[PDB]
From a paper:
Having established that protein stability does not constrain the evolvability of the enzymes, we sought a molecular explanation by solving the crystal structures of the R10 variants of the NDM1 and VIM2 trajectories, allowing us to compare them with the previously published wild-type structures. For VIM2, we were only able to crystallize the dimeric fraction of VIM2-R10. This dimer reveals an unprecedented structural rearrangement: a full half of the structure exhibits a symmetrical domain-swapping between the two subunits. Besides domain swapping, the major structural rearrangement occurring between VIM2-WT and VIM2-R10 involves the reorganization of loop 3 resulting in its disorder in VIM2-R10, which is most likely caused by six mutations within and next to loop 3. Four out of these six loop 3 mutations have accumulated by R5; thus, we speculate that these mutations and the loop rearrangement were the major cause of the ~25 fold increase in catalytic efficiency for PMH in VIM2-R10, compared to the wildtype. The monomeric VIM2-WT, however, evolved to exist in an equilibrium between monomer and dimer by VIM2-R10. We isolated monomeric and dimeric states, respectively, using size-exclusion chromatography, and determined their kinetic parameters. The catalytic efficiency of the dimeric state for PMH is eightfold lower compared to the monomeric state (kcat/KM = 510 and 60 M−1s−1 for the monomer vs. dimer, respectively), indicating that the dimer formation may be associated with an overall increase in solubility, rather than catalytic efficiency along the VIM2 trajectory. By contrast, the catalytic efficiency of VIM2 stagnated at round 6, with only a ~ 25 fold increase in kcat/KM overall (VIM2-R10 compared to the wild-type). The subsequent PMH fitness improvements resulted from increasing soluble expression, from 40% to 70%.
Metallo-β-lactamases (MBLs) encompass a genetically diverse enzyme family that confer β-lactam antibiotic resistance to bacteria. Our previous work demonstrated that most MBLs exhibit phosphonate monoester hydrolase (PMH) activity (kcat/KM) in the range of 0.1 to 10 M−1s−1. β-lactam and phosphonate monoester hydrolyses differ in the cleaved bond (C-N vs. P-O) and the geometry of the transition state (tetrahedral vs. trigonal bipyramidal), making the PMH activity a catalytically distinct promiscuous activity for these enzymes. Thus, the evolution of MBLs toward PMH activity can be considered a model for neo-functionalization or the evolutionary emergence of a new enzyme function. Here, we carried out an empirical test of enzyme evolvability by performing directed evolution with four orthologous MBLs (NDM1, VIM2, VIM7, and EBL1) toward PMH activity.
Author numbering:
A (entry chain A): 30 to 61, 66 to 261
B (entry chain B): 32 to 62, 67 to 260
The structure:
């Protein structure tokens, strides 16, 4: 029955609880779309959540605050309406504010699984074998591999080849994610990388230790071995 | 020695200088793209595939500023990887079952976002009311959004309207992008009808009040015309 928390004065990543009545709380979080208030209702010996705190950060803090102050498990949650509170790496860069660049293929692929995010189009990379200059690097589309849209980045000044998830480290002996991968085209796409960058001295995989051009041959062998 | 990602503490990002103006950035994720590139562009920096997640990306930017001291002006994504997570995704990963009306989940589909797992039936018509656990769900009709629900806690006579209800201090309509300004006052009337016994009303933002918040909200929306 005291001072209700003003959302703007709650630090980033923190959430306040306000008990309205027995087994009824309101949770308040910073509101950087302005919904700062939500509800916590006791459900027997469990808790029902109404409109969780905005964002992944605040929701995690909400659950932690609930456990600390109430000590009852949150088993169910209701969204009263739709609000896109998703934040990723590109969103943090956008607010930095760094301009993010992506191929049309990548952007169109983002649409099917969630975007609306402003990005700039990287033209001239729609066909396998295409290569364009972007600032201090060269962008290369080898074709489908780990994903239908994966690009390769080469740094000519240092002869450094970054293959992303399309390239494995030496210690990786079996194919990983593969869900969005074209296992058939993957070795062919690697061949295009090998032919277009024979001068590469430093090859960086998506995960793990860097190596030489042997990473390309290694990745192709692992993917091929993922057959029948 | 090049950092093995599994031996990097949680929430930390490493920078490995390969050559002049060329760094790799390594983040931990054994639970998963761990490597990325930083290439010097004149007196600026070009970022290749920022670290996975909002937290690591922020730590990456901080580490870049601390160690290199040059501004990141552009960033390239080599491929789409969904590290964009919201509240529903955290709830789902923590073992919390998420619920929403078919209308809300249908709206969720049209944006490719994270759909609440289970459907809340019996709320497709204006005036509909169902019980869900310790609360009553009420669909007043279109207001702040086509799908907005009202939550009533009968044991405490507490009314929660979400963004469909303003606090007293709000004298102008805010986020009204998906709002039906014409139906909003009518939908509010239905709320007033179904819950005249409500003692505490919680707005989507700001201080709680009584049933006067309903009247107040309708006045603000009408004044927007
Ligand atoms: Zn809201
Ligand atoms: Zn990938």
């Amino acid at each position: 029955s005291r001072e209700y928390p003003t959302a703007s004065e709650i630090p980033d990543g923190e959430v306040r609880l306000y008990q309205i009545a027995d087994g009824v709380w309101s949770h308040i979080a910073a509101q950087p779309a302005y919904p700062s208030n939500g509800l916590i209702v006791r459900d027997g010996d469990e808790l029902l959540l109404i409109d969780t705190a905005w964002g992944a950060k605040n929701t995690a803090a909400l659950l932690a605050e609930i456990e600390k102050q109430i000590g009852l498990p949150v088993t169910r949650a209701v969204s009263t309406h739709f609000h896109d509170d998703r934040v990723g790496g590109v969103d943090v860069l956008r607010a930095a504010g760094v301009a993010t660049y992506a191929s049309p293929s990548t952007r169109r692929l983002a649409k099917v699984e969630g975007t609306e995010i402003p990005t700039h189009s990287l033209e001239g990379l729609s066909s396998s074998g295409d290569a364009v200059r972007f600032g201090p690097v060269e962008l290369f589309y080898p074709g489908a591999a780990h994903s239908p849209d994966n690009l390769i980045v080469y740094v000519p000044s240092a002869r450094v080849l970054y293959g992303g998830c399309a390239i494995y480290e030496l210690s990786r002996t079996s194919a990983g994610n593969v869900a969005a991968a074209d296992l058939a085209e993957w070795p062919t796409s690697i061949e295009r990388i090998q032919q277009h960058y024979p001068e590469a001295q430093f090859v960086i995989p998506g995960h793990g230790l860097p190596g030489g051009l042997d990473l390309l041959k290694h990745t192709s062998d692992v993917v091929k071995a993922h057959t029948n």
